[PDB]
Amino acid sequence: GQELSQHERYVEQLKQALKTRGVKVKFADLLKFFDFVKDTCPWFPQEGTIDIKRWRRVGDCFQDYFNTFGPEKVPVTAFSYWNLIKELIDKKEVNPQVMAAVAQTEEILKSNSQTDLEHHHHHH
C-alpha cells in the first residue's frame, strides 16, 4: 500500500480512480487496504496477476479470516473497501483510468518482492 503510494506514475492514475468514485478518502486511507491485502494474501503478489478472477479470492480470504478471528481482527470495512476495487477491476474494460493502473500494479508487483527491507515489526 504505502509502497505503491510512492510510485509516482501509479499515483497519477490513482488520483483519477480515487476521485471518480466520489468517495471522500485520502490516498493514505485507500492504500492502507492495499497493505492489508499483502499481509492477508501473501500469495496474491506471487501470482502477479490482477483480474477480478484473482481479486475475488482476496475477498474470500478476508471472509475466512473474519470468521476465524472475528471483527476485532478484520474490520467489516475491509470488505467495503474491497468491493470498491472489485467493481474497478470487474469493469476495467470500460474504465481506462483504472485499467492503466491495473497494468502498472502488475508491473510493480513483478519488479518488487513479497518482503524486502527491515520490516522487523509485526503485531503491536
Curated annotation (Swiss-Prot):
Q: Which sites carry lipid of kind N-myristoyl glycine?
A: 1
Which residues are annotated as site, described as Cleavage?
Answer: 99-100
Question: Which compartment or compartments is the protein found in?
Answer: Virion
State what this protein does.
Matrix protein.
What this protein is called in its record is Matrix protein p10
Organism annotation: Mason-Pfizer monkey virus
Its organism's taxonomic lineage begins at: Viruses, Riboviria, Pararnavirae, Artverviricota, Revtraviricetes
Query: Which gene specifies this protein's sequence?
Result: gag
